[PDB]
Amino acid sequence: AKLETVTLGNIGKDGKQTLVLNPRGVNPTNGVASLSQAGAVPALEKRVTVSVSQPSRNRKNYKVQVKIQNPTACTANGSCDPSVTRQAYADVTFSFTQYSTDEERAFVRTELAALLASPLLIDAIDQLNPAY
Amino acid sequence: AKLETVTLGNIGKDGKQTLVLNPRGVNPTNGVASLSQAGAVPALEKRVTVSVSQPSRNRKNYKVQVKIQNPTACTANGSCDPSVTRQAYADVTFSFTQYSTDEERAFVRTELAALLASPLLIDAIDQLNPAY
Amino acid sequence: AKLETVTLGNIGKDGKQTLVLNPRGVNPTNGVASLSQAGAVPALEKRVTVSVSQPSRNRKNYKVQVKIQNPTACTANGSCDPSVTRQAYADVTFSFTQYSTDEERAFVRTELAALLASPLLIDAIDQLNPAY
Amino acid sequence: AKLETVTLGNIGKDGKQTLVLNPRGVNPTNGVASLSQAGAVPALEKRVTVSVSQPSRNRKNYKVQVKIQNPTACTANGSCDPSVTRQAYADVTFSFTQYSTDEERAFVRTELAALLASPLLIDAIDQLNPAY
Amino acid sequence: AKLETVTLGNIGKDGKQTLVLNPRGVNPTNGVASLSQAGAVPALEKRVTVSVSQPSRNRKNYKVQVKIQNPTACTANGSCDPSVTRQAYADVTFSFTQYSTDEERAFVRTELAALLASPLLIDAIDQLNPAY
Amino acid sequence: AKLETVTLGNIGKDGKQTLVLNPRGVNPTNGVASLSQAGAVPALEKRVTVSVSQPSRNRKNYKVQVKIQNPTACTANGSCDPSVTRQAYADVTFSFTQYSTDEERAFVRTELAALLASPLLIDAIDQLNPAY
């Protein structure tokens, strides 16, 4: 799963904009991989972090944590540094039994990708529409 | 958010399998959508929960969670009553503040679909890979 | 009483403004339709709640309820994300006998629209004068 | 808002009927003033009664309460009390704060008239149809 | 089982078509899906509604409840407001197994449809005869 | 309501099976039909019973109830005495006034058969799809 630049295009309500997710690296103390390198000033900018586990004797499974961060910087009208006042984002945790089938794992992946394109979740997220 | 036409396509390594969910109602006391058209029996295995998109004064901030179960059950040796042995489960929280806009919420939802489509999450899930 | 956009023509003291009440859905634990215009997580959000129901046979009658909310606040000067501090609203409950026809129920609905547009209710706002 | 006769045209199921509500006054210890059919008996049958604040001792608030009743009087089997019939009232409240503007209040009054004319309330009231 | 108008007939002893249940929608708090005849007055119509299930994992029994109401009303000796003097009724609940099933329920649904034509019920129900 | 073996055709999803319910006497109360299937195991597992309306008395001692019970066994290889692992069931209650013609009684049984054959209940019961 080489941490190569990921470009996610055709995103937003109408599928019109893009995000560059250019890798900062993988953390040596915890296995966490993260995508940044936007050229933009830190903590105001959009970031994507994906961490993984090993099929450890203490878990019997493999996990993937996918967290997307797209905070808004605001900026007080005065002083110095800008700062985030608004959070607007999501965190997907996956669990795959170490003895699971790869296709089962592959289904879970795309099932979410497909739900994210489903009118029910589109309305629940973009319009904040109550299900029914 | 009307419950209708929810089919998840491009499921699996080949991008060819589908799962039909077309939710047909929500939990009457919680506002929780129940997604599965797997079959009279398979609907007890292949399941998606999407909730709670219903707004409130005691929520302020907006949150939706999606719970995806894609289990395989094994038939008893020489008997009735098959049961699940393997998952292949995902659970995502979408969390936006009280003042968030639709474009940012949408950005993330479509960003996740694009991210799932991206090779980084294909090898992370199918080969269980750290990002190298 | 479908979850279709309701466009309200000419409103306000001089009959000049209009609303587009983009439907969101029915809040399932409450059973009430909800329309709102921007789709932002609400504070300063126009909101319309509508329902028709059949109470249990302790009440033995039919009801329709409508609530129209008009929140407002001043600018969060020097910062971001202003809250709602003031709200005006309509709240109408229509209580009907189960043996009544649609036409009389309609008279109650239509007479109110005709009366709301009449000089007495115009003065009970414009001047804020008491009724005699 | 001293009462005056109000002619409510374009009313009922087809939006084509006319009903005239003539004033009935009392010093409004009971804040509700009355507009009703000329009578003598119909005056006590089809009526709208209206209370306009005059905020209470709690310094709350500007409001208007309109109560609309349109019974079907019926003469049958030799009786002498046709005026005793089917209920009830549409209880209408225009709810405001203390220093709401006249424009804010007017929107509530005219938005409601505009919504009463909308298919959403037409079907909820005449056919008693649910939002689905 | 999307609600749609249901036409029923050859129900009475004359073999004639009778019954059409038109308005549709589901009360989401109650889990009750309508169909009915009240073109104007609800209190005089015929109704068939179904309780629409979604069992917990501690039951898995998707009970379907078919509620049948067939009231008869009179004016006859009066000028207005017909009201119910007699009512025929049925209430049928269908159980489901803990692992679900398929054909076995089809047998129960169709067994009952066939059973209702059995000479034992024709007299046990039409003449109220004890079986004997 | 003479006791005779009841033979019902049109059973199952394709309408091709036949179920035969042989009398087992009437003593829960006189006339409560007890009809069971053929063979030692079906004699334990599959049956239909029918309740009995009484001579006047307070109208509590009424309501024909048809109970369709279809438990089914599973066996070990070479096992003697099969036992139930699944049960399908229909709890069918009828209610009439003591004055309800003869026609209404017939009407409700056939209306129910007409509903059971309807796509609305085919999907609610065989496909487990809520009627939304």
UniProtKB/Swiss-Prot annotation, chains A, B, C, D, E, F:
The keyword RNA-binding applies. Its main location: virion. One of its GO terms (cellular component) is T=3 icosahedral viral capsid. Keywords: Capsid protein, RNA-binding, T=3 icosahedral capsid protein, Translation regulation, Virion. Changing residue 59 to C: Decreased RNA-binding to the viral operator and loss of repressor activity. The keyword Hydrolase does not apply. It comes from the Viruses. It is found in: Virion. The record marks 89 as: RNA-binding. GO terms for molecular function: RNA binding; structural molecule activity; translation repressor activity. It holds the Pfam family Levi_coat. Changing residue 49 to A: Decreased RNA-binding to the viral operator and loss of repressor activity. Changing residue 63 to E: Decreased RNA-binding to the viral operator and loss of repressor activity. InterPro entries: Levivir_coat, Phage_RNA-type_capsid. Changing residue 32 to A: Decreased RNA-binding to the viral operator and loss of repressor activity. Changing residue 56 to P: Decreased RNA-binding to the viral operator and loss of repressor activity. Capsid protein self-assembles to form an icosahedral capsid with a T=3 symmetry, about 26 nm in diameter, and consisting of 89 capsid proteins dimers (178 capsid proteins). Involved in viral genome encapsidation through the interaction between a capsid protein dimer and the multiple packaging signals present in the RNA genome. Binding of the capsid proteins to the viral RNA induces a conformational change required for efficient T=3 shell formation. The capsid also contains 1 copy of the A2 maturation protein. Acts as a translational repressor of viral replicase synthesis late in infection. This latter function is the result of capsid protein interaction with an RNA hairpin which contains the replicase ribosome-binding site. Homodimer. The homodimers binds to the viral RNA via an operator hairpin, but also to many other RNA sequences in the viral genome; this interaction probably shifts the virus from the replicative to the assembly phase and ensures specific encapsidation of the viral genome. Interacts with the maturation protein A2. Belongs to the Leviviricetes capsid protein family. This is Capsid protein.
